Amino acid sequence: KRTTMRILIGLLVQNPELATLVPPLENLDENKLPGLGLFRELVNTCLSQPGLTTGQLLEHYRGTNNAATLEKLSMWDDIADKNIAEQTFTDSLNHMFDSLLELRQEELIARERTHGLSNEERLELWTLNQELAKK
């Protein structure tokens, strides 16, 4: 499989302190990722509950319509770590960002061959291509 909103969420579930390691989502938003809202809510809620834990998370969502999804991520043996969790969080986050920058790149070039994006937007692409040339 791919990253998907599963690694970012399931890692945050198993490690709610990763909520302090996540950015303010400026280049992401809930618009560019149709489902990041679940991750963003979870982080936002973790930041709203200082001292929340892996197990206490389910108790904070006890009996919620979303608890079933959170149960799936909690019982998620597909990771089950805490050291690899942080590394995979950064790598996953990088993958999400990479993909959004890839999408943005294609959006920009799709607006060059017709609309004509600005000289700056056409240059932004060069810089972005250099960032993508070396992960």
Side-chain angles (χ1 to χ4, degrees), residues 50-116:
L52 181 146
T53 79
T54 317
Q56 201 63 51
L57 178 63
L58 276 64
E59 210 75 301
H60 184 53
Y61 285 108
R62 180 82 195 216
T64 292
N65 187 71
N66 311 343
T69 307
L70 273 164
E71 248 181 271
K72 190 80 81 232
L73 261 14
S74 190
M75 66 96 68
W76 210 34
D77 235 72
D78 201 78
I79 29 169
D81 204 278
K82 287 174 187 78
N83 199 256
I84 304 178
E86 189 250 313
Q87 213 292 127
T88 309
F89 195 82
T90 307
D91 197 57
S92 199
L93 196 138
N94 246 302
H95 171 300
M96 231 65 160
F97 276 58
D98 161 271
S99 182
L100 296 160
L101 299 160
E102 182 197 84
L103 288 174
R104 189 70 197 169
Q105 196 244 71
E106 214 180 354
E107 222 66 73
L108 282 153
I109 297 299
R111 288 160 179 276
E112 90 87 77
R113 232 286 172 195
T114 176
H115 220 330

Short mmCIF file of all heavy atoms in Angstrom, two decimals, residues 50-116:
data_model
loop_
_atom_site.label_atom_id
_atom_site.label_comp_id
_atom_site.label_asym_id
_atom_site.label_seq_id
_atom_site.Cartn_x
_atom_site.Cartn_y
_atom_site.Cartn_z
N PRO A 50 -4.21 18.33 26.74
CA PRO A 50 -2.83 18.16 27.18
C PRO A 50 -2.76 17.01 28.20
O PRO A 50 -3.43 17.04 29.23
CB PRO A 50 -2.41 19.51 27.77
CG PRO A 50 -3.74 20.13 28.22
CD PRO A 50 -4.74 19.61 27.19
N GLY A 51 -1.96 15.98 27.89
CA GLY A 51 -1.82 14.77 28.71
C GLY A 51 -2.67 13.60 28.20
O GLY A 51 -2.78 12.60 28.91
N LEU A 52 -3.29 13.72 27.02
CA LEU A 52 -4.00 12.64 26.35
C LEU A 52 -2.99 11.53 26.02
O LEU A 52 -1.81 11.80 25.83
CB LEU A 52 -4.70 13.22 25.10
CG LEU A 52 -5.53 12.23 24.27
CD1 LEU A 52 -6.75 12.91 23.64
CD2 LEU A 52 -4.71 11.64 23.12
N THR A 53 -3.46 10.29 25.94
CA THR A 53 -2.61 9.11 25.75
C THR A 53 -3.24 8.22 24.67
O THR A 53 -4.41 8.40 24.35
CB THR A 53 -2.44 8.33 27.07
OG1 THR A 53 -3.57 7.54 27.38
CG2 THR A 53 -2.25 9.20 28.32
N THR A 54 -2.50 7.21 24.20
CA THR A 54 -2.95 6.19 23.26
C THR A 54 -4.29 5.58 23.70
O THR A 54 -5.22 5.45 22.91
CB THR A 54 -1.87 5.10 23.21
OG1 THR A 54 -0.57 5.66 23.15
CG2 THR A 54 -2.17 4.07 22.12
N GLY A 55 -4.37 5.18 24.97
CA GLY A 55 -5.55 4.47 25.46
C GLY A 55 -6.64 5.48 25.82
O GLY A 55 -7.82 5.28 25.50
N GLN A 56 -6.25 6.58 26.45
CA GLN A 56 -7.14 7.65 26.89
C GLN A 56 -7.84 8.32 25.70
O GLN A 56 -8.90 8.90 25.88
CB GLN A 56 -6.38 8.64 27.77
CG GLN A 56 -7.23 9.51 28.71
CD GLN A 56 -7.99 8.67 29.74
OE1 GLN A 56 -7.40 7.83 30.42
NE2 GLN A 56 -9.29 8.83 29.89
N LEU A 57 -7.24 8.27 24.50
CA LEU A 57 -7.83 8.76 23.27
C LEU A 57 -9.18 8.09 23.02
O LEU A 57 -10.17 8.78 22.76
CB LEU A 57 -6.87 8.43 22.12
CG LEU A 57 -7.38 8.85 20.74
CD1 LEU A 57 -7.58 10.36 20.59
CD2 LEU A 57 -6.36 8.37 19.71
N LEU A 58 -9.24 6.76 23.11
CA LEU A 58 -10.48 6.02 22.88
C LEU A 58 -11.50 6.37 23.95
O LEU A 58 -12.69 6.44 23.65
CB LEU A 58 -10.26 4.50 22.88
CG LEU A 58 -9.78 3.94 21.53
CD1 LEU A 58 -8.40 4.50 21.17
CD2 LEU A 58 -9.76 2.41 21.58
N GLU A 59 -11.05 6.62 25.18
CA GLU A 59 -11.95 7.00 26.26
C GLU A 59 -12.48 8.43 26.04
O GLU A 59 -13.62 8.73 26.37
CB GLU A 59 -11.25 6.82 27.62
CG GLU A 59 -12.18 6.48 28.81
CD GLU A 59 -12.70 5.03 28.84
OE1 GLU A 59 -13.36 4.59 27.88
OE2 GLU A 59 -12.46 4.31 29.84
N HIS A 60 -11.68 9.30 25.42
CA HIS A 60 -12.11 10.66 25.05
C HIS A 60 -13.13 10.66 23.90
O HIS A 60 -13.94 11.58 23.80
CB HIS A 60 -10.88 11.50 24.67
CG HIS A 60 -11.19 12.95 24.37
ND1 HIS A 60 -11.88 13.83 25.18
CD2 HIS A 60 -10.86 13.62 23.22
CE1 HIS A 60 -11.93 15.01 24.54
NE2 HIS A 60 -11.32 14.93 23.35
N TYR A 61 -13.19 9.58 23.13
CA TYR A 61 -14.13 9.35 22.03
C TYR A 61 -15.09 8.21 22.40
O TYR A 61 -15.75 7.65 21.52
CB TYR A 61 -13.35 9.11 20.72
CG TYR A 61 -12.73 10.36 20.09
CD1 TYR A 61 -11.34 10.56 20.13
CD2 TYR A 61 -13.55 11.30 19.43
CE1 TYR A 61 -10.77 11.66 19.46
CE2 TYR A 61 -12.98 12.39 18.75
CZ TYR A 61 -11.58 12.56 18.74
OH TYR A 61 -11.00 13.57 18.02
N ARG A 62 -15.20 7.85 23.68
CA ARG A 62 -15.98 6.70 24.12
C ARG A 62 -17.42 6.82 23.62
O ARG A 62 -18.12 7.76 23.97
CB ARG A 62 -15.91 6.62 25.65
CG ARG A 62 -16.70 5.45 26.24
CD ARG A 62 -15.86 4.18 26.16
NE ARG A 62 -16.61 2.94 26.35
CZ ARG A 62 -16.09 1.88 26.99
NH1 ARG A 62 -14.89 1.90 27.58
NH2 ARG A 62 -16.85 0.78 27.00
N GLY A 63 -17.86 5.84 22.84
CA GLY A 63 -19.24 5.80 22.36
C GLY A 63 -19.51 6.76 21.19
O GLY A 63 -20.67 7.05 20.92
N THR A 64 -18.49 7.25 20.49
CA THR A 64 -18.66 8.24 19.44
C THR A 64 -18.80 7.50 18.12
O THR A 64 -18.22 6.44 17.92
CB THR A 64 -17.44 9.19 19.46
OG1 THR A 64 -17.49 9.95 20.64
CG2 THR A 64 -17.31 10.15 18.27
N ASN A 65 -19.53 8.08 17.16
CA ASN A 65 -19.69 7.53 15.81
C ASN A 65 -18.34 7.33 15.09
O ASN A 65 -18.20 6.50 14.20
CB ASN A 65 -20.60 8.45 14.99
CG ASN A 65 -20.92 7.80 13.65
OD1 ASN A 65 -21.65 6.83 13.59
ND2 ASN A 65 -20.40 8.32 12.55
N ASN A 66 -17.32 8.06 15.57
CA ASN A 66 -15.97 8.07 15.01
C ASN A 66 -15.11 7.05 15.73
O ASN A 66 -14.04 6.68 15.21
CB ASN A 66 -15.29 9.48 15.09
CG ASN A 66 -16.15 10.64 14.59
OD1 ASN A 66 -17.14 10.43 13.89
ND2 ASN A 66 -15.83 11.86 14.98
N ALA A 67 -15.53 6.60 16.92
CA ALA A 67 -14.83 5.62 17.74
C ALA A 67 -14.56 4.35 16.94
O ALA A 67 -13.47 3.82 17.08
CB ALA A 67 -15.63 5.29 19.00
N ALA A 68 -15.47 3.89 16.08
CA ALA A 68 -15.27 2.70 15.25
C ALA A 68 -14.03 2.84 14.35
O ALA A 68 -13.24 1.90 14.20
CB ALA A 68 -16.53 2.46 14.42
N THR A 69 -13.86 4.00 13.72
CA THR A 69 -12.69 4.32 12.90
C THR A 69 -11.44 4.38 13.80
O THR A 69 -10.40 3.84 13.44
CB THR A 69 -12.95 5.65 12.17
OG1 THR A 69 -14.17 5.58 11.45
CG2 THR A 69 -11.83 6.01 11.18
N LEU A 70 -11.55 5.01 14.97
CA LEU A 70 -10.45 5.12 15.92
C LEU A 70 -10.05 3.77 16.50
O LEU A 70 -8.86 3.54 16.73
CB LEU A 70 -10.82 6.11 17.03
CG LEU A 70 -10.46 7.55 16.63
CD1 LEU A 70 -11.17 8.54 17.56
CD2 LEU A 70 -8.94 7.73 16.71
N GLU A 71 -11.00 2.86 16.68
CA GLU A 71 -10.79 1.48 17.11
C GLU A 71 -9.93 0.78 16.07
O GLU A 71 -8.98 0.10 16.44
CB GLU A 71 -12.13 0.74 17.26
CG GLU A 71 -12.45 0.39 18.72
CD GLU A 71 -13.78 -0.37 18.81
OE1 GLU A 71 -14.83 0.30 18.93
OE2 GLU A 71 -13.75 -1.62 18.72
N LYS A 72 -10.24 0.97 14.78
CA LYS A 72 -9.55 0.32 13.67
C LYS A 72 -8.08 0.73 13.67
O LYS A 72 -7.24 -0.09 13.30
CB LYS A 72 -10.20 0.72 12.33
CG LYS A 72 -9.69 -0.11 11.13
CD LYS A 72 -10.36 -1.48 11.04
CE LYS A 72 -11.72 -1.29 10.37
NZ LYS A 72 -12.84 -1.89 11.13
N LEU A 73 -7.81 1.98 14.01
CA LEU A 73 -6.49 2.58 14.06
C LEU A 73 -5.71 2.26 15.32
O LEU A 73 -4.48 2.25 15.33
CB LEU A 73 -6.71 4.09 14.02
CG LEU A 73 -6.52 4.69 12.63
CD1 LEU A 73 -6.45 3.80 11.37
CD2 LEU A 73 -7.62 5.73 12.41
N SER A 74 -6.43 2.08 16.40
CA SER A 74 -5.90 1.65 17.69
C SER A 74 -5.46 0.18 17.63
O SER A 74 -4.31 -0.12 17.91
CB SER A 74 -6.94 1.94 18.78
OG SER A 74 -6.41 1.75 20.09
N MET A 75 -6.32 -0.75 17.21
CA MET A 75 -6.02 -2.18 17.01
C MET A 75 -5.12 -2.47 15.80
O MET A 75 -4.98 -3.61 15.36
CB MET A 75 -7.35 -2.95 16.85
CG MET A 75 -8.14 -2.60 15.57
SD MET A 75 -7.98 -3.63 14.08
CE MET A 75 -8.76 -5.15 14.68
N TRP A 76 -4.57 -1.41 15.22
CA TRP A 76 -3.81 -1.45 14.00
C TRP A 76 -2.38 -1.95 14.19
O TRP A 76 -1.42 -1.17 14.28
CB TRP A 76 -3.93 -0.07 13.35
CG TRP A 76 -3.84 -0.03 11.86
CD1 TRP A 76 -4.30 -0.96 11.00
CD2 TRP A 76 -3.21 0.99 11.06
NE1 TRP A 76 -3.85 -0.67 9.73
CE2 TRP A 76 -3.18 0.54 9.72
CE3 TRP A 76 -2.61 2.22 11.36
CZ2 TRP A 76 -2.48 1.24 8.73
CZ3 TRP A 76 -1.89 2.92 10.39
CH2 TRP A 76 -1.79 2.41 9.09
N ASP A 77 -2.23 -3.27 14.16
CA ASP A 77 -0.96 -4.01 14.20
C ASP A 77 -0.06 -3.72 12.98
O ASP A 77 1.06 -4.21 12.89
CB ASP A 77 -1.22 -5.53 14.31
CG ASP A 77 -0.47 -6.08 15.53
OD1 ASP A 77 -0.93 -5.78 16.65
OD2 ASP A 77 0.53 -6.82 15.33
N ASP A 78 -0.53 -2.90 12.04
CA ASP A 78 0.17 -2.55 10.78
C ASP A 78 1.39 -1.64 11.02
O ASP A 78 2.06 -1.23 10.08
CB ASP A 78 -0.84 -1.87 9.85
CG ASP A 78 -0.49 -1.87 8.35
OD1 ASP A 78 -0.69 -2.92 7.71
OD2 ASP A 78 -0.30 -0.77 7.77
N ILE A 79 1.64 -1.27 12.29
CA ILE A 79 2.69 -0.38 12.76
C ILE A 79 3.12 -0.78 14.18
O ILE A 79 4.28 -1.15 14.36
CB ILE A 79 2.27 1.11 12.65
CG1 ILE A 79 0.74 1.37 12.78
CG2 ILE A 79 2.84 1.72 11.36
CD1 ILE A 79 0.40 2.86 12.93
N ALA A 80 2.22 -0.70 15.17
CA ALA A 80 2.35 -1.14 16.57
C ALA A 80 3.64 -0.72 17.32
O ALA A 80 3.97 -1.29 18.36
CB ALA A 80 2.11 -2.65 16.64
N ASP A 81 4.32 0.33 16.85
CA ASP A 81 5.62 0.77 17.37
C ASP A 81 5.50 2.17 17.98
O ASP A 81 4.43 2.79 17.95
CB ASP A 81 6.67 0.71 16.24
CG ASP A 81 8.09 0.56 16.81
OD1 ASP A 81 8.68 1.60 17.20
OD2 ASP A 81 8.59 -0.57 16.91
N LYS A 82 6.60 2.69 18.54
CA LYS A 82 6.73 4.01 19.15
C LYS A 82 8.02 4.72 18.72
O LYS A 82 8.04 5.94 18.68
CB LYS A 82 6.70 3.87 20.68
CG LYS A 82 5.29 3.55 21.18
CD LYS A 82 5.28 3.25 22.69
CE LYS A 82 3.88 2.77 23.10
NZ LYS A 82 3.63 1.36 22.73
N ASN A 83 9.09 3.98 18.42
CA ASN A 83 10.34 4.50 17.89
C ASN A 83 10.20 4.68 16.38
O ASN A 83 10.33 5.79 15.86
CB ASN A 83 11.46 3.49 18.21
CG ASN A 83 12.80 4.18 18.09
OD1 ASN A 83 13.54 3.99 17.13
ND2 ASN A 83 13.13 4.98 19.09
N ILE A 84 9.85 3.60 15.68
CA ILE A 84 9.55 3.59 14.25
C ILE A 84 8.39 4.55 14.00
O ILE A 84 8.33 5.13 12.92
CB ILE A 84 9.26 2.15 13.74
CG1 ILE A 84 10.43 1.18 14.05
CG2 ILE A 84 8.91 2.14 12.24
CD1 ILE A 84 10.19 -0.28 13.63
N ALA A 85 7.49 4.76 14.98
CA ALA A 85 6.38 5.68 14.86
C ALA A 85 6.85 7.08 14.45
O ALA A 85 6.29 7.63 13.51
CB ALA A 85 5.57 5.75 16.15
N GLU A 86 7.84 7.65 15.14
CA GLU A 86 8.29 9.02 14.89
C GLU A 86 8.92 9.11 13.49
O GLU A 86 8.49 9.92 12.68
CB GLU A 86 9.25 9.45 16.01
CG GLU A 86 9.62 10.94 15.99
CD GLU A 86 11.08 11.22 15.59
OE1 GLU A 86 11.97 10.54 16.14
OE2 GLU A 86 11.29 12.13 14.76
N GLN A 87 9.83 8.20 13.18
CA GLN A 87 10.48 8.11 11.87
C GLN A 87 9.43 8.00 10.75
O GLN A 87 9.49 8.73 9.76
CB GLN A 87 11.44 6.90 11.88
CG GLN A 87 12.70 7.07 11.01
CD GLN A 87 12.45 7.11 9.50
OE1 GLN A 87 12.88 8.04 8.83
NE2 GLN A 87 11.83 6.10 8.92
N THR A 88 8.47 7.09 10.91
CA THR A 88 7.41 6.87 9.94
C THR A 88 6.51 8.11 9.89
O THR A 88 6.02 8.42 8.82
CB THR A 88 6.62 5.59 10.28
OG1 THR A 88 7.53 4.52 10.46
CG2 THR A 88 5.65 5.12 9.19
N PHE A 89 6.32 8.86 10.98
CA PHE A 89 5.51 10.07 11.00
C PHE A 89 6.16 11.10 10.10
O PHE A 89 5.51 11.59 9.19
CB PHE A 89 5.33 10.62 12.42
CG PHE A 89 4.23 11.66 12.54
CD1 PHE A 89 2.91 11.20 12.65
CD2 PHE A 89 4.52 13.03 12.64
CE1 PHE A 89 1.88 12.10 12.96
CE2 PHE A 89 3.48 13.94 12.92
CZ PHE A 89 2.16 13.47 13.10
N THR A 90 7.44 11.41 10.32
CA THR A 90 8.18 12.35 9.50
C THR A 90 8.18 11.86 8.05
O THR A 90 7.90 12.67 7.16
CB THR A 90 9.58 12.51 10.10
OG1 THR A 90 9.49 12.84 11.47
CG2 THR A 90 10.45 13.55 9.36
N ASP A 91 8.44 10.58 7.77
CA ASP A 91 8.49 10.07 6.39
C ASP A 91 7.13 10.18 5.69
O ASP A 91 7.02 10.58 4.53
CB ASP A 91 8.99 8.63 6.34
CG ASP A 91 9.43 8.24 4.92
OD1 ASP A 91 10.32 8.92 4.35
OD2 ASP A 91 8.87 7.25 4.39
N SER A 92 6.06 9.85 6.42
CA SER A 92 4.66 9.90 6.00
C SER A 92 4.25 11.34 5.71
O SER A 92 3.57 11.63 4.72
CB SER A 92 3.78 9.28 7.08
OG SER A 92 2.53 8.93 6.59
N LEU A 93 4.54 12.24 6.65
CA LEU A 93 4.32 13.65 6.54
C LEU A 93 5.03 14.14 5.28
O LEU A 93 4.38 14.78 4.45
CB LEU A 93 4.73 14.36 7.82
CG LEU A 93 4.17 15.79 7.90
CD1 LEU A 93 3.67 16.05 9.32
CD2 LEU A 93 5.24 16.82 7.54
N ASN A 94 6.32 13.80 5.10
CA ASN A 94 7.09 14.15 3.93
C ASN A 94 6.37 13.64 2.68
O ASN A 94 6.24 14.39 1.72
CB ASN A 94 8.50 13.55 3.98
CG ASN A 94 9.58 14.61 4.10
OD1 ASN A 94 9.68 15.48 3.26
ND2 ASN A 94 10.40 14.58 5.14
N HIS A 95 5.85 12.41 2.69
CA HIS A 95 5.13 11.83 1.56
C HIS A 95 3.87 12.64 1.26
O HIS A 95 3.52 12.84 0.09
CB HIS A 95 4.80 10.35 1.86
CG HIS A 95 3.88 9.68 0.87
ND1 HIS A 95 2.59 10.07 0.57
CD2 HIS A 95 4.16 8.58 0.10
CE1 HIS A 95 2.12 9.25 -0.38
NE2 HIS A 95 3.01 8.28 -0.64
N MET A 96 3.11 13.02 2.28
CA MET A 96 1.92 13.82 2.10
C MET A 96 2.32 15.14 1.46
O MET A 96 1.71 15.51 0.45
CB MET A 96 1.18 14.04 3.43
CG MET A 96 -0.31 13.70 3.34
SD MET A 96 -0.68 11.95 3.01
CE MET A 96 -2.40 11.87 3.58
N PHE A 97 3.30 15.84 2.01
CA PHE A 97 3.76 17.13 1.52
C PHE A 97 4.26 16.99 0.08
O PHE A 97 3.77 17.70 -0.78
CB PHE A 97 4.83 17.68 2.46
CG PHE A 97 4.32 18.43 3.69
CD1 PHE A 97 3.46 17.82 4.63
CD2 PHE A 97 4.71 19.77 3.89
CE1 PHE A 97 3.02 18.55 5.75
CE2 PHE A 97 4.25 20.50 5.00
CZ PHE A 97 3.41 19.88 5.93
N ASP A 98 5.12 16.01 -0.21
CA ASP A 98 5.67 15.67 -1.52
C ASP A 98 4.56 15.54 -2.54
O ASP A 98 4.56 16.22 -3.56
CB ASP A 98 6.43 14.33 -1.40
CG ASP A 98 6.66 13.61 -2.73
OD1 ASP A 98 5.78 12.84 -3.11
OD2 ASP A 98 7.71 13.75 -3.36
N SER A 99 3.55 14.73 -2.22
CA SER A 99 2.37 14.54 -3.04
C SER A 99 1.61 15.85 -3.28
O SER A 99 1.15 16.09 -4.39
CB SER A 99 1.51 13.51 -2.32
OG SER A 99 0.33 13.20 -3.05
N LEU A 100 1.42 16.69 -2.26
CA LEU A 100 0.73 17.97 -2.42
C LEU A 100 1.52 18.92 -3.31
O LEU A 100 0.92 19.63 -4.11
CB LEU A 100 0.52 18.64 -1.06
CG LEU A 100 -0.42 17.83 -0.15
CD1 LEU A 100 -0.21 18.25 1.30
CD2 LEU A 100 -1.88 18.00 -0.52
N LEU A 101 2.85 18.93 -3.17
CA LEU A 101 3.77 19.71 -3.99
C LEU A 101 3.76 19.15 -5.42
O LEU A 101 3.74 19.94 -6.35
CB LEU A 101 5.18 19.69 -3.35
CG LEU A 101 5.24 20.29 -1.93
CD1 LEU A 101 6.49 19.82 -1.17
CD2 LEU A 101 5.18 21.82 -1.88
N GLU A 102 3.68 17.83 -5.61
CA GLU A 102 3.54 17.16 -6.90
C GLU A 102 2.24 17.61 -7.57
O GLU A 102 2.25 18.06 -8.71
CB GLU A 102 3.58 15.64 -6.72
CG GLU A 102 3.50 14.86 -8.04
CD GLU A 102 3.12 13.40 -7.75
OE1 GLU A 102 1.92 13.06 -7.61
OE2 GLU A 102 4.04 12.58 -7.61
N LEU A 103 1.12 17.52 -6.83
CA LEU A 103 -0.19 17.95 -7.30
C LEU A 103 -0.11 19.43 -7.67
O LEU A 103 -0.57 19.82 -8.73
CB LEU A 103 -1.29 17.73 -6.23
CG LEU A 103 -1.68 16.26 -6.00
CD1 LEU A 103 -2.66 16.13 -4.82
CD2 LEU A 103 -2.26 15.61 -7.26
N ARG A 104 0.47 20.27 -6.80
CA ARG A 104 0.60 21.69 -7.06
C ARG A 104 1.41 21.92 -8.33
O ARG A 104 1.00 22.74 -9.14
CB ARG A 104 1.20 22.43 -5.84
CG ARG A 104 1.16 23.96 -5.99
CD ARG A 104 -0.25 24.55 -5.91
NE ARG A 104 -0.31 25.94 -6.44
CZ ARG A 104 -1.43 26.61 -6.70
NH1 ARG A 104 -2.60 26.01 -6.45
NH2 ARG A 104 -1.38 27.86 -7.18
N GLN A 105 2.53 21.21 -8.51
CA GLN A 105 3.35 21.26 -9.71
C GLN A 105 2.48 20.98 -10.94
O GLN A 105 2.48 21.78 -11.88
CB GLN A 105 4.52 20.25 -9.64
CG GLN A 105 5.59 20.57 -10.69
CD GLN A 105 5.79 19.49 -11.76
OE1 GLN A 105 4.95 19.29 -12.63
NE2 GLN A 105 6.96 18.86 -11.78
N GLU A 106 1.73 19.88 -10.93
CA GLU A 106 0.92 19.53 -12.08
C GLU A 106 -0.17 20.57 -12.33
O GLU A 106 -0.44 20.90 -13.48
CB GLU A 106 0.36 18.10 -11.94
CG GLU A 106 0.31 17.53 -13.36
CD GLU A 106 -0.20 16.10 -13.60
OE1 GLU A 106 -0.50 15.31 -12.67
OE2 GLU A 106 -0.26 15.79 -14.82
N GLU A 107 -0.74 21.14 -11.27
CA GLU A 107 -1.74 22.21 -11.32
C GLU A 107 -1.17 23.47 -11.98
O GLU A 107 -1.84 24.11 -12.79
CB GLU A 107 -2.25 22.54 -9.90
CG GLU A 107 -3.76 22.77 -9.88
CD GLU A 107 -4.53 21.48 -10.20
OE1 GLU A 107 -4.58 20.56 -9.35
OE2 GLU A 107 -5.11 21.44 -11.31
N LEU A 108 0.05 23.83 -11.60
CA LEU A 108 0.78 24.98 -12.13
C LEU A 108 1.02 24.75 -13.62
O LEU A 108 0.61 25.59 -14.43
CB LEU A 108 2.10 25.14 -11.37
CG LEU A 108 1.96 25.80 -9.98
CD1 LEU A 108 3.07 25.38 -9.02
CD2 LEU A 108 2.03 27.32 -10.07
N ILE A 109 1.64 23.63 -14.01
CA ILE A 109 1.96 23.38 -15.41
C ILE A 109 0.64 23.26 -16.22
O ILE A 109 0.53 23.78 -17.33
CB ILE A 109 2.87 22.14 -15.59
CG1 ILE A 109 4.25 22.33 -14.91
CG2 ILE A 109 3.11 21.77 -17.06
CD1 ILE A 109 5.12 23.50 -15.43
N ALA A 110 -0.41 22.66 -15.65
CA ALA A 110 -1.71 22.61 -16.29
C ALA A 110 -2.29 24.01 -16.50
O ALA A 110 -3.08 24.20 -17.42
CB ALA A 110 -2.69 21.75 -15.48
N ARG A 111 -1.89 25.00 -15.72
CA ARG A 111 -2.27 26.40 -15.89
C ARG A 111 -1.22 27.20 -16.66
O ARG A 111 -1.50 28.36 -16.92
CB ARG A 111 -2.60 26.98 -14.50
CG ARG A 111 -3.94 26.37 -14.05
CD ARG A 111 -4.20 26.43 -12.55
NE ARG A 111 -5.52 25.83 -12.24
CZ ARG A 111 -6.71 26.45 -12.29
NH1 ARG A 111 -6.79 27.77 -12.46
NH2 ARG A 111 -7.84 25.76 -12.17
N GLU A 112 -0.10 26.62 -17.11
CA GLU A 112 0.87 27.32 -17.96
C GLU A 112 0.49 27.20 -19.43
O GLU A 112 0.40 28.21 -20.14
CB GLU A 112 2.33 26.91 -17.64
CG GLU A 112 2.97 25.71 -18.38
CD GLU A 112 3.62 26.06 -19.72
OE1 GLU A 112 4.75 26.62 -19.70
OE2 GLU A 112 3.02 25.74 -20.77
N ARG A 113 0.11 26.00 -19.86
CA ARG A 113 -0.17 25.64 -21.25
C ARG A 113 -1.50 26.20 -21.76
O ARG A 113 -1.90 25.91 -22.89
CB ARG A 113 -0.09 24.10 -21.38
CG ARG A 113 0.84 23.65 -22.51
CD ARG A 113 0.23 23.85 -23.91
NE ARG A 113 1.22 23.59 -24.97
CZ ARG A 113 1.08 23.95 -26.25
NH1 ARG A 113 -0.11 24.21 -26.79
NH2 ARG A 113 2.17 24.05 -27.01
N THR A 114 -2.21 26.94 -20.93
CA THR A 114 -3.50 27.50 -21.27
C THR A 114 -3.57 28.91 -20.70
O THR A 114 -3.22 29.87 -21.39
CB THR A 114 -4.62 26.55 -20.83
OG1 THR A 114 -5.87 27.14 -21.09
CG2 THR A 114 -4.53 25.98 -19.40
N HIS A 115 -4.03 29.02 -19.46
CA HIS A 115 -4.23 30.30 -18.79
C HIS A 115 -2.98 31.18 -18.86
O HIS A 115 -3.07 32.33 -19.29
CB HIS A 115 -4.70 30.11 -17.34
CG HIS A 115 -5.76 31.10 -16.91
ND1 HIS A 115 -5.92 32.39 -17.35
CD2 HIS A 115 -6.76 30.84 -16.01
CE1 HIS A 115 -7.00 32.90 -16.73
NE2 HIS A 115 -7.53 32.00 -15.87
N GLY A 116 -1.83 30.60 -18.52
CA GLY A 116 -0.57 31.28 -18.45
C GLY A 116 -0.42 31.80 -17.04
O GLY A 116 -0.88 32.90 -16.71
#
